[PDB]
Amino acid sequence: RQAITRAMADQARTIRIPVHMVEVINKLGRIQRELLQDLGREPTPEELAKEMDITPEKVLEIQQYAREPISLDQTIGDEGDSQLGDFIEDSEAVVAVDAVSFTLLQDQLQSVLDTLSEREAGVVRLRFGLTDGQPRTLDEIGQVYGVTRERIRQIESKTMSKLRHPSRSQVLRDYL
Amino acid sequence: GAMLDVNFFDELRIGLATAEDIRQWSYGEVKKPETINYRTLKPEKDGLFCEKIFGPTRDWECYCGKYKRVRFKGIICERCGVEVTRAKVRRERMGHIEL
Amino acid sequence: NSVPGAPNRVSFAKLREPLEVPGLLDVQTDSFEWLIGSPRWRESAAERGDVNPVGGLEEVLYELSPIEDFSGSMSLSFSDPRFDDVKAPVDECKDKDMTYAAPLFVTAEFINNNTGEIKSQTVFMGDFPMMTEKGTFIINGTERVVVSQLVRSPGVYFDETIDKSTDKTLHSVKVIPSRGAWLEFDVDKRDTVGVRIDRKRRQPVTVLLKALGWTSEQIVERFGFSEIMRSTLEKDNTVGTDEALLDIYRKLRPGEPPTKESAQTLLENLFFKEKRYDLARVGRYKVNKKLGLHVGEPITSSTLTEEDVVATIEYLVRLHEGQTTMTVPGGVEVPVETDDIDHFGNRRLRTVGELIQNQIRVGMSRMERVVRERMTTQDVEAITPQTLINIRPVVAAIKEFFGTSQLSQFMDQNNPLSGLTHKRRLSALGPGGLSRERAGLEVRDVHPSHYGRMCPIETPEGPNIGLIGSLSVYARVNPFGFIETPYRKVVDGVVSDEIVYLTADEEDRHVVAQANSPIDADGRFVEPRVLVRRKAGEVEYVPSSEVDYMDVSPRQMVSVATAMIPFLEHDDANRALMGANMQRQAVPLVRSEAPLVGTGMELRAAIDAGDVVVAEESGVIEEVSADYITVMHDNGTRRTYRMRKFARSNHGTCANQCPIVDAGDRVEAGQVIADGPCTDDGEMALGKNLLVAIMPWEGHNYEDAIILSNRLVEEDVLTSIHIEEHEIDARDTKLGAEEITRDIPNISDEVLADLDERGIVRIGAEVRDGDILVGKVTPKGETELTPEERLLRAIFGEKAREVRDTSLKVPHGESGKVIGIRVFSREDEDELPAGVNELVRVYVAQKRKISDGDKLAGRHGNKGVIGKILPVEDMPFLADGTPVDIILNTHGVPRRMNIGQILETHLGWCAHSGWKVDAAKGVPDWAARLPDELLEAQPNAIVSTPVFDGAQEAELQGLLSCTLPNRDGDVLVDADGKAMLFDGRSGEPFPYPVTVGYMYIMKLHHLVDDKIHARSTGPYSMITQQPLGGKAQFGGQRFGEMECWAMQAYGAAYTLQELLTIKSDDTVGRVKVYEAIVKGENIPEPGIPESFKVLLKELQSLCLNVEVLSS
Amino acid sequence: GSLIDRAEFEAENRRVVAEGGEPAAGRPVLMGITKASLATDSWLSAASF
Amino acid sequence: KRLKVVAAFQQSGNSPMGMVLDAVPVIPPELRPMVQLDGGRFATSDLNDLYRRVINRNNRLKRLIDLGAPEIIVNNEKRMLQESVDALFDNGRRGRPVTGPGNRPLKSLSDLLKGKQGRFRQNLLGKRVDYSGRSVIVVGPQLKLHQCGLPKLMALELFKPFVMKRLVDLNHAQNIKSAKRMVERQRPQVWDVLEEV
Amino acid sequence: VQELFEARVPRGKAPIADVTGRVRLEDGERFYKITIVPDDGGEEVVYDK
Amino acid sequence: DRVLRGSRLGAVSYETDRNHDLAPRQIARYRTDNGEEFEVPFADDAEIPGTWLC
């Protein structure tokens, strides 16, 4: 009986649950069912938490963990010709208008950054990591520019004060 | 013949595949009847969804997060074991069972 | 007549009827009251079969008890089912989504045998759903209807076939029970009667006979005359009872070693021990009536017997002998003939009571196995019936029967006629019934035993034709499940008024006269030769001495909704079918005016559908408003009836109930007190009365198109209210808990004006497609940002706003006001499902006008969408200035054989203008058989032609000749029924007179706003990458196989490459197509489809090496 | 007993009248449309049918 | 009838040893996904149960062989593994089909191809397309023969990227994002652009 | 039409002649018999059922 | 009582797919018992484990 119960608790569910949580799930189900038979009313979560001497939020966590998944090959409609898996929207796909909007945003940002000088645009692109993935820090840009980091930081502050102008913001405001 | 499918084909040969072909297609041997960790919802190790066998779930990310961008691509994390690449190779890599 | 608040609707009916229409929900209500065991059913059964008052639960609990162990040392029994009061009333259940139910209680008794102890406990069996006042169930707040099912009854069904090689008749028999095994006694190409038992063919009859213990002497004695039986008794090649038993055991068992106690018990377990073979009381009555075994004995011992088996073999061999009648020793004689499987004496009706009893029995079996399991493993002198019984399989069986089973349907209600005909519906298919591929051509036919038991007209017209029909008007269900029909008995040519309800077999035994036969007003027939219906459905004339039964009325053979068609006897059958189907899909308008010309079946079919507030007890009105009426009874008491102002029906239509009594009137018990959705002064009203001309007008009314005036859009003649709901739920998640709030990130203050403080909208805000209803925000989690996003947030200074916005936006192409916000919560202690925190429902309501594209129809199957709404002045008017309203088409009338619309148009014009038959010198010759007070009528008067006895054509001519003028001296319509219209557009009169009149058309539920759809780029599928489907999602149309064949047959190949690569599956192709269109470049060359790649991976996973080769 | 095309079989008679001459004897047969479409040259159009 | 398959194995460069199977392959997981819904509810893909049964019985057979068991248990375990792989490849072929919850037979690998619901007759030959529409029809007797009517509320959704490019080109919007929002709000100039496109 | 394109043997299968010549008609018991005499040295073709 | 909107358990980013430079990497050659060879490209600064699951 030990081998049968342990092996059923291991290989019963499609998502594997350890045996102590399966034990408390079985205890919760038997407790709720017996209190329904002896009561005539299906009890409350606080009643079950009173009976099992645990907290009601733990009772809700257990009753959320106890739910087994559904299968994607069932008949959704009236007649059976439609699987469930044909009506699930793939949200991780490409929305295909925001991608081309991202491309146009990159080109617009290129135009706006190229309306300034060379040192400013280079420091900004190295600071925020546009030509490469990793953003260079102030010490890295001071190394690549032959200066200290304080001049780099003053250049950064002055350029960020420059870029908040409406002449450089009226085209980029609608991109957020 | 072709394997990257450049839409330049002239034949499509079917054939009865041997065990030497089966264990040549596969990337890793699945050896546990688990799918997903019940608590953190991550793919289990050596399961039917294992990220070492079938590839990573996140774009250019290993399992332990030690390599997390495109500059580490085409390498394998020496701790976790997931080859860091795009996450769309979970649609194309196969595994096998040794009976 | 005989309804206290009836409008005076004068009838053209020539002949009196004896029997009024029975209560139309009597099948549902009386079957459920049979199941419960209600005292009303108790006194009715005491009137009609008083020998055994047995309910459904009592029958199941008595076929269950007793329940013992294997040792027989302890027994558990059941007794006394008994209900309680319901836990909540109907409207509260529909509000808070609770199911309308009541608890079951059962007195259980556990008996120990050796020492002897009985233990009486009151076991709570479960929550049992209860039927409402109108025959509907309520499940989870929705409203459901259980449909009846037609199955073939148990018994013996003798039938013959030809063999088409030797061309000899090969008879057979199928002793088919309820819940048992089968057995067939065929006749082969030879004369060896094959006894294929449980579909294991061999072994002629001597095997079963000597297996029963019969010797060759007794086989010779009972079966001596039969050449077939003596040939088999010589070709038996087996002597000995045990010699037969070992053959039976080795062929039926095989895979088990035989022994002389197993074959001793196997046959006695299969067909006689009643734990495995219980043909029901229906089957016992059917077999005992078919062979004539017992006559007056009550129905008990529901298993078979060896007497019945040898009677079956004797009947079969005398049927192959070609005899006429047979008397088995021990019983009365019976005729010898083959049986049919489509006769209505063999198809019983499994109604709702038997349907719920079956699921309760299949729950009680699984409870019984658990109880008899734990009656051993539990220790003795320690058990109690509270510990024995597990009610979980019974409550799960009830729950799985009501929710998600194809005979427990979601009740449709777009009008009370469709509610009423959604009940009283017979379906031949379902669980335990044949599917549509097993449905042969023979079962869809109309057998001649359908006269008055099932309507031949009303049925669906898709692939389900003939499998679903409705009951007739006067039909009534037997106690056993057959369908009874009334008949007036005539004695010696004197038609009496006693009424005898007759099923199909007794309808075959006698001869039955016609409904509209000329009675001589004494009971005597006028002519000696009367039409009649013979046994097999033959139609003959007959001398009137032989006729012993007469129909109760015409329209007996027809359904409810088909009896509401005027002039049915002039139409065809297919267009009448389309009219009876399209009559129930009408929508409720805002005004709902009663029809001018109708039949007598509107008042009864409206007050019997339950959607009209009817005064329970008489008295006087105290107080009226738009919500509540309080009558004052004769003795002190008062009673408030609450209305339903704008409730949402089950399909998105309005459910108004306005009152129709003033504050001083006196109502009697049964008077209609408030209209319903589609009613006017009590009776049904599905549309409006519209002036119509039958000319073809400039190709706009071409090929079943209908044009209308602008007066219907202006004066709101055709206008329905539609109410939809939207539902969202704030629940917990892994990262936190979603909240309903005003602070939605990355949103302006423009869309946040209509929202109030707790996030939901106000009441009365007119919304458009894409506006915020419920402002809900989710915890987003941790994501990395693109550098452009990072420096843009640095440029504008705006923060991260780490929670993701997912509101409830009103979907595409919807608008209207916001009626009501019913918001539940967890903190206010409502019954919410596990893991949910806050549920909220918002009800949006729009007021749809009429529009071109909407589907209109008359009452004779003359459908057609609206072609063009003309303005008022370019619409052909009469010689009075009155414009016509709609213009039908001429060419659709004569080729469809439905001139009932032309007769209804003529009689409608007569009823609108009003007439006066000038009997100055005597009543004229056409109107000599008209009733009185039909010689003259006021304008806008109502009339009523019944179905098969109505206005004659000569009487229509005579009414249409004398048709008193409008306001001037002006008879606008001559004796032909036509008028001289003027062209409203050019100006000249039309050169020929044109038929006009007042028709009655209804607006169907096929509006355009539920059909028009488009898609540029929406969602996509999961496994494959195709776009999704249907208007519920965004979805795209299906470019199937035959359209690909057409595109190949054109020679157009590039469009096929387009539609099959870069619009459905080219995952890197779609975004390049979009970018190329936006930037203005050429479309790139496509690539391979992902569905083909999926095909390749599945073929590689089926151990098939598939290598794609370059060269 | 194997059904082969009239073009492929007659070309194989051309290859076999040389290099030692004997003809494979054949008589023309008439087959229905399900039987004809399944024995095509492509295993993709046949399996899709 | 025998020479057909024997010459089929003899002519090509094939071996008959591949009819038995020493290593089963696994389909990639994105063709049998475990997608979670909104609200934590999960959805398997009905091949995971067959794969899990094969994995379970294979591990148990390996443990029985390494443990050392009598012939009855090992023979029954090997026939169990054989039945599981046969049910994986074609459920309902030999004997009773393997049913899941609710007495529904599971969708095996061959059932992704067979019949009308397979890949061939459902998703390879006829697919759902984009840039599409559907509505009811009426008679238009003033049109010429090559013309057709069209509702503007439907043609505005059919021709959305064309009209987006065109009203970006005419300076009615700053970029594609405000142009798309302008189409969604249906401002009174988008019809004047819609006629041109 | 479906039995033509599928090339089944038909229901009302009427035999045809196989050679020129005169016939030997027989009206048998419940089913006839027809035999065709050839104009050459061949056996007379019999059609029984 | 909601809309069927699924999502696989994983995120999809999009960065610059450039192959002109990568991180420098070694290649370790692992060997099983049955005469098999395998190549696993680890990074340069990576403690290469003495065993490996092939």
Ligand SMILES: C/C(=C\[C@H](C)CCCCC(=O)O)[C@@H]1O[C@@H]2C=C[C@@H]1OC(=O)\C=C/C=C\C=C\[C@H]1O[C@@H]3C[C@H]1O[C@@H](/C=C/C[C@H]1O[C@H](C[C@H](O)[C@H]1C)[C@@H](O)[C@@H](O)/C=C/CC/C=C/C2)[C@@H]3C
């Ligand atoms: C095909 C079928 C039912 C169809 C869905 C509806 C009727 C088809 C005939 C027609 O085309 O008009 C069979 O129905 C049952 C057995 C199995 C079959 O169900 C089936 O196999 C198909 C579905 C079985 C249970 C479905 C439950 C849920 O499916 C939705 C919600 C739940 O119930 C359904 C409600 C259907 C009510 C219909 O009612 C009809 C009109 C509309 O088609 C519907 C409003 C009315 O004409 C009404 O008079 C007809 C009722 C059908 C009579 C009983 C038949 C037995 C709704 C479609």
Ligand SMILES: [Zn+2]
């Ligand atoms: Zn790692």
